[PDB]
Amino acid sequence: QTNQLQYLLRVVLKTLWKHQFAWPFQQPVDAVKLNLPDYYKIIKTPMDMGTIKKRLENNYYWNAQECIQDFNTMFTNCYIYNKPGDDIVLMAEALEKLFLQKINELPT
Amino acid sequence: PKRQTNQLQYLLRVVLKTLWKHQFAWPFQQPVDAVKLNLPDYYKIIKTPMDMGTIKKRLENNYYWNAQECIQDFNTMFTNCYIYNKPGDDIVLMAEALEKLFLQKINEL
Amino acid sequence: WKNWCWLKRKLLLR
Numbered sequence: 001q002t003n004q005l006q007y008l009l010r011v012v013l014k015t016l017w018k019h020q021f022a023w024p025f026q027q028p029v030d031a032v033k034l035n036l037p038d039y040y041k042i043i044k045t046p047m048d049m050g051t052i053k054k055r056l057e058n059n060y061y062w063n064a065q066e067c068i069q070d071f072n073t074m075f076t077n078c079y080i081y082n083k084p085g086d087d088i089v090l091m092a093e094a095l096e097k098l099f100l101q102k103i104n105e106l107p108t
Numbered sequence: 109p110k111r112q113t114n115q116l117q118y119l120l121r122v123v124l125k126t127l128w129k130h131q132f133a134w135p136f137q138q139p140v141d142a143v144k145l146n147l148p149d150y151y152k153i154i155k156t157p158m159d160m161g162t163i164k165k166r167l168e169n170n171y172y173w174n175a176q177e178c179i180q181d182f183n184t185m186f187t188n189c190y191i192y193n194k195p196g197d198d199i200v201l202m203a204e205a206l207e208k209l210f211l212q213k214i215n216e217l
Numbered sequence: 218w219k220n221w222c223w224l225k226r227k228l229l230l231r
Contacts, residue, residue, distance in 0.1 A: 134226065
């Protein structure tokens with residue numbers, strides 16, 4: 001699915017990347033550097049937009065569903081690790097709503 | 109106390125060094141970037157921003173006239189946190205601990 | 218203690 005993956009990179013990911021809420025999700029959560037000793041115990045599948053970007057740029061995805069799954073993992077990780085009403089959850093919910101608006105227009 | 113350079117050196121070498129090593133000091137070691145942190149009304153509520161990183165470089169570079177001016181910046185930093193946030197917030201519990209330690213150490217000037 | 222790392226930590230604190 002070359003065309004769907006090209007859209008995920010140039011439209012979906014780029015749109016989220018340019019939002020001012022993107023920065024907490026643009027690189028992996030380094031739990032050691034961030035002094036989060038419990039992060040890897042709770043979150044078993046870390047994921048971020050920087051990793052998604054490199055996977056799209058290096059053709060590591062075989063279809064669009066693989067890429068969409070990584071986006072959802074990123075969002076759920078944030079919802080699981082943080083509480084409702086946390087500032088970062090507000091940012092993630094807005095980014096996910098934005099994500100779903102662009103996934104509606106995915107080509108066939 | 110006439111030698112105000114000495115009291116300021118104590119604030120830097122003893123007071124600030126002790127606070128800097130506290131486990132709850134880190135939220136106050138850089139200026140609050142209200143845009144990046146999505147705090148849209150922060151600069152409207154807080155008119156005199158202050159942080160320990162700014163106090164540190166001011167102490168190191170001979171900015172203050174006397175110790176009370178430096179103490180005034182510490183108090184502004186703490187009150188800013190109390191004003192903008194709600195009682196019982198995690199960051200307020202951290203500010204209260206630093207302030208208690210701060211007031212504990214300035215007694216020994 | 219600075220830049221992104223400090224900001225992230227700062228964000229998670231709220």
